[PDB]
Design an enzyme around this catalytic site. Structure first.
Site, short mmCIF file in Angstrom:
data_model
loop_
_atom_site.label_atom_id
_atom_site.label_comp_id
_atom_site.label_asym_id
_atom_site.label_seq_id
_atom_site.Cartn_x
_atom_site.Cartn_y
_atom_site.Cartn_z
N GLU A 170 1.09 -4.44 8.03
CA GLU A 170 2.35 -4.86 7.47
C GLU A 170 3.49 -4.68 8.46
O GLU A 170 4.66 -4.76 8.11
CB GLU A 170 2.64 -4.16 6.13
CG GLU A 170 2.85 -2.65 6.17
CD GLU A 170 3.02 -2.04 4.77
OE1 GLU A 170 2.86 -0.81 4.63
OE2 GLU A 170 3.32 -2.79 3.81
N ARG A 175 -1.87 6.01 -2.10
CA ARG A 175 -1.06 5.58 -0.97
C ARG A 175 -0.03 6.66 -0.64
O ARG A 175 0.90 6.91 -1.42
CB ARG A 175 -0.35 4.23 -1.26
CG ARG A 175 0.49 3.72 -0.08
CD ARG A 175 0.78 2.20 -0.16
NE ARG A 175 1.78 1.85 -1.17
CZ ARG A 175 2.44 0.70 -1.21
NH1 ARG A 175 2.23 -0.22 -0.28
NH2 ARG A 175 3.34 0.47 -2.16
N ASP A 213 7.97 -4.02 -5.15
CA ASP A 213 8.39 -2.68 -4.79
C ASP A 213 9.57 -2.71 -3.82
O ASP A 213 10.25 -3.73 -3.69
CB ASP A 213 7.24 -1.84 -4.24
CG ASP A 213 6.72 -2.32 -2.89
OD1 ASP A 213 7.31 -3.23 -2.26
OD2 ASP A 213 5.69 -1.77 -2.46
N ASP A 233 6.92 -6.69 3.18
CA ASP A 233 7.16 -5.71 4.26
C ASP A 233 7.02 -6.34 5.64
O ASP A 233 7.87 -6.15 6.50
CB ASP A 233 6.20 -4.52 4.16
CG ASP A 233 6.88 -3.23 3.70
OD1 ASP A 233 8.10 -3.07 3.92
OD2 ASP A 233 6.19 -2.37 3.11
O1 LIG Z 1 3.05 -2.75 0.24
C1 LIG Z 1 3.66 -3.83 0.15
O2 LIG Z 1 3.99 -4.59 1.09
C2 LIG Z 1 4.14 -4.24 -1.34
C3 LIG Z 1 4.46 -5.75 -1.54
S1 LIG Z 1 4.64 -5.94 -3.39
C4 LIG Z 1 4.20 -4.15 -3.58
C5 LIG Z 1 4.02 -3.66 -4.99
C6 LIG Z 1 4.47 -4.42 -6.06
C7 LIG Z 1 4.32 -3.90 -7.36
N1 LIG Z 1 3.78 -2.69 -7.62
C8 LIG Z 1 3.37 -1.97 -6.55
C9 LIG Z 1 3.48 -2.40 -5.23
N2 LIG Z 1 3.31 -3.82 -2.48
MG LIG Z 2 4.55 -2.41 2.06
#
Ligand SMILES: O=C(O)[C@H]1CS[C@@H](c2ccncc2)N1
Ligand SMILES: [Mg+2]
Length: 712
Positions: free
Chosen positions: A421, A328, A620, A449
């Site tokens: 998102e 990512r 996150d 998000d």
């Molecule tokens: O991209 C997103 O919207 C988020 C929501 S929780 C997160 C995540 C939680 C734990 N470890 C990695 C990523 N991904």
């Molecule tokens: Mg996100």
């Protein structure tokens, strides 16, 4: 300074050396040519990148104004829709089409299963994730609350045999449900053997085969006394390990040692919201782990080999022993000083990530030390977060196309995972998919998000419902179904992943097992899990639900309307008592403080963080976005005062201090001396003015401030 001149660019020496010494060798890309390409790509694409960010601001400004000139009352959807159309926020929907993406691995095109996301800056988490393709069910069951910790079956210092027997029984039932015997139950088996290429399960009174012999995948050891038996159901493998001379086998009726489930089929190595990387030194640490993973030489513990088996009839084969890796990249907003121009202007981070993670990914396309590590079909899989609408997707595709040239890769080698998102993507999703119709390998949804964007976009409309309420609002439920519908209508079934969001409650696995099954039932080929242990448990759901059949059944359905997507989550008249308001404030202030303190002070972007009720959450950066936008929204509309926010921050800070009882330094009681406390305060009080409510500009500044103080 400490920089390298390449055309208009001034590259941090740590980055220059990393790329020349570590990333370029073995790729057969001309070093001078690569750097010329970096300069060329940054110059050509920077202005459009900036143009897109200004158009976000311009659309947001027009919607803020639409709300501000209107008084109370029910929305009136037809005018609101019409307005979004006039300003170019809502675009017309293109005719039906099918994605044409090619050269994609089976793990993505056909296999339904859990998907892990882990911070790339954490070498140990990354390694564990890569190796999480095959996970122990007995470990996942014994170790979590899936087997209740009630009387007699509590987890102690050493092996609890009452608990282990419940584990065994749970796994026997899973076998009965997933790979039925023609007669009897796995619970009564005394042995397993292979005769005439068929699995024979010995029962006390008779023998029997599988109700579906086709589910026998193979075995290890002698046919007449195997060390393991391999099964398959819904495209996922299940391995029964047989070892009477093990801790557990010795207590088992067939001498079964464990059940291994193919678990995390794919894993996303994250440079975005789970990591704190605010300068060149941080980015190199990340790029370096991404390199070790792709070369297969990262060691923090090492990477797994492929698994050898014997086919039912007697021949040999192998199966992948590692999770297939995505990366990512960061999104379109942020700049990073890893590279600056001659004016001193920082370069866009997303553009750099494309260049550098893509260069580095070449290594995963060739022999390690040692078949190649990652994609055998020749693809690089990049998840692209926080895009707003089809022009931004089109831009990322053009970016990938230019990077491909520089790297001498064939066009469309770089595949895209489109995160849905942001609201402007949601309501233009079909068009976003079409923009990437030759590159897309997944779409996905989430809570944190997208809800942050929901709040910010309609910030001027009025007070929003509480955070916990958001999860069941009409807009988000329509958002989820609309995402699946768009994917399936674009032909994703058999071609690309349709994914859903993360389970954040790391220790509530019983609850996960009970409720996360809704995701594959809704036709998601994959969903996000926070740990290898959770991956194994979530794999259970894909054995119970035939995702492929589910998707085939949803074919052609239109289950959400644009109206539903556009239903703003405004609170109703006098929805809350004073104590419920205080609870929500406390909840959001604690979530901000708990996360921000580790981020700013220790550069940690993900970890098991206790919430206000001491439930462990692994979220996150998006948790910051939602909490801060909600608080800012409540402050904007007079639900709470600034003294209310202050008092909550003051209450929650010592509680967070205690939850961190190490290099931790308490925020209390000298708050204005704590950079992380001041960061938390700023996210809230400046929330309404942050572009789309993004937290990065403030977070990155404060972390760089902390680092600078730490160097004195
Ligand atoms: O991209 C997103 O919207 C988020 C929501 S929780 C997160 C995540 C939680 C734990 N470890 C990695 C990523 N991904
Ligand atoms: Mg996100």
């Amino acid at each position: 300074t400490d920089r390298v001149s390449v055309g208009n660019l001034r590259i941090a020496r740590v980055l220059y050396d990393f790329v020349n010494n570590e990333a370029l060798p073995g790729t057969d890309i001309d070093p001078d040519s690569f750097w010329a390409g970096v300069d060329k790509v940054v110059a050509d694409l920077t202005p459009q990148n900036q143009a897109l960010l200004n158009a976000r601001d311009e659309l947001q400004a027009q919607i803020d104004k639409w709300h501000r000139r209107r008084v109370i009352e029910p929305i009136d959807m037809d005018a609101y829709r019409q307005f979004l159309t006039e300003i170019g926020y809502l675009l017309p929907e293109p005719d039906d089409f099918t994605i044409t993406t090619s050269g994609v691995d089976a793990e993505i095109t056909t296999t339904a299963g859990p998907q892990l996301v882990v911070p790339v800056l954490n070498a140990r988490f990354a390694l564990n994730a890569a190796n999480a393709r095959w996970g122990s069910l007995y470990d996942a069951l014994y170790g979590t609350d899936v087997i209740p910790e009630t009387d007699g079956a509590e987890k102690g210092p050493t092996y609890n045999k009452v608990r282990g027997d419940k584990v065994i029984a749970y796994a026997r039932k899973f076998l009965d449900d997933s790979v039925p015997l023609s007669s009897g139950s796995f619970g009564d088996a005394t042995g397993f053997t292979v005769q005439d290429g068929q699995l024979v399960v010995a029962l006390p009174d008779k023998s029997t085969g599988l109700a579906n012999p086709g589910q026998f995948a193979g075995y290890t050891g002698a046919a007449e006394s195997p060390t393991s038996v391999l099964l398959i159901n819904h495209g996922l493998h299940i391995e029964i390990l047989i070892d009477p001379e093990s801790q557990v086998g010795t207590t088992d009726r067939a001498g079964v040692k464990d059940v291994i489930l193919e678990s995390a089929i794919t894993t996303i190595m994250d440079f975005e919201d789970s990591v704190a990387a605010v300068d060149a030194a941080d980015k190199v640490l990340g790029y370096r782990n991404w390199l070790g993973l792709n070369k297969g030489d990262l060691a923090a513990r090492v990477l797994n080999r492929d698994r050898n088996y014997t086919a039912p009839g007697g021949g040999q084969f192998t199966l992948p022993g590692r999770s297939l890796m995505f990366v990512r990249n960061v999104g379109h907003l942020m700049t990073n000083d890893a590279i600056v121009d001659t004016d001193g202007s920082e370069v866009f981070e997303g553009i750099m990530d494309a260049l550098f993670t893509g260069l580095i990914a070449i290594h995963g396309l060739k022999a390690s030390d040692g078949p190649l590590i990652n994609s055998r079909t020749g693809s690089i899989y990049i998840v692209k977060p926080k895009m707003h609408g089809p022009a931004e997707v089109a831009f990322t595709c053009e970016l990938f196309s230019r990077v491909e040239d520089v790297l001498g890769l064939p066009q469309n080698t770089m595949k895209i995972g489109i995160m849905d998102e942001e609201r402007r993507t949601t309501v233009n999703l079909k068009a976003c998919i079409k923009a990437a119709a030759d590159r897309v390998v997944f779409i996905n949804t989430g809570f944190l998000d997208r809800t942050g964007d929901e709040i910010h976009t309609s910030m001027e409309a009025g007070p929003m419902v509480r955070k916990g309420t958001m999860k069941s609002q009409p807009w988000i439920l329509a958002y989820e179904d609309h995402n699946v519908d768009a994917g399936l209508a674009a032909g994703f079934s058999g071609r690309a992943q349709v994914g859903k969001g993360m389970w954040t409650m790391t220790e509530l696995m019983a609850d996960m097992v009970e409720t996360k099954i809704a995701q594959p039932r809704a036709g998601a080929s994959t969903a996000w899990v926070p740990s290898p242990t959770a991956a194994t448990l979530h794999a259970l759901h894909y054995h119970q639900v035939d995702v492929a059949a589910v998707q085939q059944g949803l074919a052609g359905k239109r289950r959400a309307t644009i109206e539903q997507l556009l239903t703003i989550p405004l609170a109703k008249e006098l929805a809350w008592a004073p104590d419920e308001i205080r609870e929500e404030v406390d909840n959001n202030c604690q979530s901000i403080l708990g996360y921000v303190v580790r981020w700013v002070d220790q550069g940690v972007g993900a970890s098991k963080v206790p919430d206000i009720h001491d439930v462990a959450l692994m979220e996150d950066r998006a948790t910051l976005r939602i909490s801060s936008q909600l608080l800012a929204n409540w402050l904007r509309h007079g639900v709470i005062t600034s003294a209310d926010v202050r008092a909550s921050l003051e209450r929650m800070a010592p509680l967070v201090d205690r939850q961190n009882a190490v290099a931790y330094r308490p925020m209390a009681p000298n708050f204005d001396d704590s950079i992380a406390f001041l960061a938390a305060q700023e996210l809230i009080l400046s929330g309404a003015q942050q572009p789309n409510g993004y937290t990065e500009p403030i977070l990155h500044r404060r972390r760089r401030e902390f680092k600078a103080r730490a160097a004195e």
